[PDB]
Amino acid sequence: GPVAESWCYTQIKVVKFSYMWTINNFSFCREEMGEVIKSSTFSSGANDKLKWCLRVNPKGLDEESKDYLSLYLLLVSCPKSEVRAKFKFSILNAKGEETKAMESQRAYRFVQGKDWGFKKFIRRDFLLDEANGLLPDDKLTLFCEVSVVQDSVNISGQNTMNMVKVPECRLADELGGLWENSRFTDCCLCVAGQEFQAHKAILAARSPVFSAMFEHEMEESKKNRVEINDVEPEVFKEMMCFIYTGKAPNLDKMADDLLAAADKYALERLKVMCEDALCSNLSVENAAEILILADLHSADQLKTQAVDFINYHASDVLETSGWKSMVVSHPHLVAEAYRSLASAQCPFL
Template identity: 50%
Template sequence: SASSEKIHSSEDLQSSRMASSYNYTQVCVKFSCSWTISNFSFADDENGASLTSSTFSDASGRLKWALQLYPNGVDSVQEGYVSCFAVLVSAPEAGVRACARLVLLNAEGQEAMVIENNYYTRVYEGDQIGSELFSRNDVLDDASGLLQDDKLTLTCKVSITGCLVISTAQVKEPDSSLAFELGELWEESLLTDCTLCVAGQEFKAHKSILSRTRLISEMEPDVLKEILTYIYSGKAPNIRQMAAKLLAAADMYLLDRLKSMCEDTLCSSLTVDNAAETLILGDLHQAQHTKNDAVTFINVNAEEVTKTDGWTTLTDDHPHLITDLYQSLVSAGEPPAKRQRRF
């Protein structure tokens, strides 16, 4: 049967420029790899059967790719062709904009058959880039010179543009002055002297502690519980599930450290689907780091973001944010008319 030899890959950082937000870098990366398949003529020639290479990735390990080859086509429509694809195995939720160049080498290592697209398209985890244009008969024909010792060698170059590298520790959190013992005091309801009632739920607390934060109970029970957990312990264990609601509460009750924690969570969780809503949130609650990062993310992923419900809400109810987005483009030194079209 056919077997795969070790795949060789390399990465070339073509260009890099800082976007308008301090903790984003927009880059263009090119991956190249070579894959040799031994005993190719013995590969399963059933329509739909495939061979898959080992994975290769960028330097950060955030993007992982593999090559996939169908010796007799992906389906009945492609039967009679050797179908070759670059598969995005692992990627951020927002995907990446990429194009690929797939080449079959002859016995002398020269390019014999080439599949290339020169435009970038957005691909997500599990998507493929490639074609079925290699004729199976041509590949197996001795005259083609593609097989030497029954080995088929495929090279691939994947180019990625507009991807975002997000720095860690995006928002510096002020030091907490809350003692660990306070958390235990609240969790065990020791020496409590007041009760907060929200939607039929009661939370025992201490007047002396709550008076310092000017906390009132006009919020959902789960949010109030998380706020109380933070006030007593300095921690917010469920922040990822309720960062938006906690940000609003932290802004209202002047809990600056919690607000910073919420911003960090929101900035690290930006996606095409939530970017517009995150920008609105940052604007409403004076969360400048969140606002800046959302602006940058939207500009890089403009075509996809403008198709979301959040974008409709932004344009209808918060049109002033369109100005912020435009100003970000101008300050980046890349006027809209000259930006590469996003597919």
């Protein structure tokens, strides 16, 4: 049984009657063919508004039956529009067990005055026979079962999926919020006159450089009044945003001096983010100073990509005054570029 997410339970209400119909002194039928005996009206607890009755002909109702008992069912009151029904009849013998039971194969509709039943019910001679016990002590016993169907209803239920939904990771969010809110600050940064503030453990975890003068028993002097003079405060605030959160929102406008800050403080992750930022602006004129900053800050991937770019576009780099100043002030780096261009991407002649 597969699990579903929606389902419907179409239920059609069905009720069952239980009726007894016993007539005494049946051998005194007192009439010839074509005469009926209407029963007493009966119902059940619900809905108690459908009044049923039975008509029975001891002799044959028609010339075709004659030597035949015939039994019918009739409905006399219908508060609704119409009612379809099923029925099973039976003759109770001397012992009381059901014999000669015939039922209806269709759900016949009934209106007030409509009858349904078996006119060819049982042979009258077979009933009047005594060996089968169908007429005990001049009593005729009949067993009536009437089943009534009602209008169909659909409860319908949407089954449960309702699995556990978990929240996302929040550590970056609350640690970043802890950065601005600065609850229970332990150290007071100083940057170009600004007096920033931060904790101690997160810094000594992010940067080996910070833990260098923190592990060497330098707490009571340097932690309260730590002085930093290299980085400007805007970039310095941005790199603590990186320290506490792990994100660099506006790196694209400050990729150079934040790379200088990353080189100073050994934040290798931010080093490679600055490599990322300064890679994707490679124009034919700025590659000289890109090489300058790459060699000054010991960058690897950005330096290699800049060397490949200047080897590709040396037709226009050489005209720039940055390249001439590069050649003058940096003897070794031009030689390194010559080395890389020598045994790569021109060995075909």
